[PDB]
Amino acid sequence: KSVVARVAEARPEDVGKRIVRMDKAERAKLGVSVGDVVEVKKV
Amino acid sequence: KSVVARVAEARPEDVGKRIVRMDKAERAKLGVSVGDVVEVKKV
């Protein structure tokens, strides 16, 4: 499965880090673990 | 276009919120604004 989510601004500490933060329930839905590579696209 | 990134844990204020935090570089490359809906797919 893939997951839909709403765009929020990154906290300033995370600037330029090439990450997406997602909580454990959304990671489980996507079947990802921390550090996995995801792809993000406009709907 | 696509933003490819590494999954990281949700910040504690964001647990449950169904959001994906994205810095201005990423949001610009996607062409999305805060509150816009995106799809996250595992690679």
Side-chain angles (χ1 to χ4, degrees):
Chain A
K1 204 207 193 102
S2 93
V3 305
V4 183
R6 233 178 284 275
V7 155
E9 314 172 36
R11 301 309 196 193
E13 46 260 75
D14 298 327
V15 81
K17 276 205 238 161
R18 245 207 69 213
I19 56 169
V20 300
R21 294 197 177 277
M22 350 184 77
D23 73 2
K24 185 171 51 171
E26 291 306 320
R27 286 198 304 279
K29 281 179 199 163
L30 244 179
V32 288
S33 295
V34 165
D36 283 349
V37 175
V38 301
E39 169 176 49
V40 184
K41 275 140 63 193
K42 197 169 64 168
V43 154
Chain B
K1 299 205 185 260
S2 293
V3 163
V4 173
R6 288 207 190 274
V7 69
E9 77 186 25
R11 283 171 183 290
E13 50 272 25
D14 300 337
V15 177
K17 268 183 193 310
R18 177 187 255 125
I19 63 181
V20 54
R21 293 213 178 248
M22 300 195 58
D23 56 69
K24 184 250 169 184
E26 304 184 274
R27 293 193 308 268
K29 179 163 145 164
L30 258 177
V32 287
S33 313
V34 178
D36 278 358
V37 164
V38 290
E39 221 177 29
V40 180
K41 268 199 172 129
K42 178 155 96 327
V43 177

